[PDB]
């Protein structure tokens, strides 16, 4: 198992986070399982981001709903983050991981950190 | 037993008959057919 994230290390306050994870092997067969994101800046514990399952639901923490988006490939290459509005507070790393319900996070992804360039 | 298939409890001589000589089997051996076409239960129970 490899899931490899990628991203930009410093980003404009204005600009886009387009982050990537691509995850290799999986048993595609089965119903509840998907992918996740998880935020960690140092300082404060971990927050958690976004999930996507295999049927396209599109789901992420509460009052977040306009500034986050995700993009499917389709093809079982890799799944794409995208951040519009950011606020500063934000520069963190990210772990992208396979989300199963009873395992709350099954394989850990290396993850990629960024911060504002302002 | 020669005496018993007689009723009597003196016999006298040649040749007489009794049980016969019975030869008894051992264990069971059971070969139906191969298992094959086995019922599609597998995918409805993994279904998703
Ligand atoms: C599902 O498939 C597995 C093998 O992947 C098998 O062991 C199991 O008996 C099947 N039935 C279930 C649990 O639905």
């Known amino acids: 198992i490899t899931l490899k994230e990628s991203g930009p290390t410093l980003v404009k306050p204005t600009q886009t986070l387009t982050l990537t994870c691509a995850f290799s092997?999986?048993?595609?067969?089965?119903?509840?399982?998907?992918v996740g994101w998880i935020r960690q800046p140092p300082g404060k514990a971990l927050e958690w981001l976004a999930l996507?399952?295999?049927?396209?639901?599109?789901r992420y923490n509460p009052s977040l709903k306009s500034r986050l988006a995700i993009i499917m490939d389709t093809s079982k290459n890799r799944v794409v983050l995208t951040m519009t509005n950011m606020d500063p507070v934000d520069t963190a790393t990210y772990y992208c991981?396979?989300?199963?319900?009873?395992?709350?996070?099954?394989?850990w992804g290396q993850g990629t950190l960024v911060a504002v360039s302002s | 037993e020669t005496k018993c298939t007689l009723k009597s409890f003196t016999v006298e001589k040649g040749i007489y008959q009794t049980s016969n000589f019975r030869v008894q089997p051992t264990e069971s051996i059971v070969r139906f057919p191969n298992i094959t076409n086995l019922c599609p239960f597998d995918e409805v129970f993994n279904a998703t």
């Open positions: 991981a396979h989300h199963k319900i009873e395992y709350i996070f099954d394989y």
């Open positions: 092997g999986f048993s595609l067969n089965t119903g509840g399982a998907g």
């Open positions: 996507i399952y295999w049927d396209g639901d599109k």
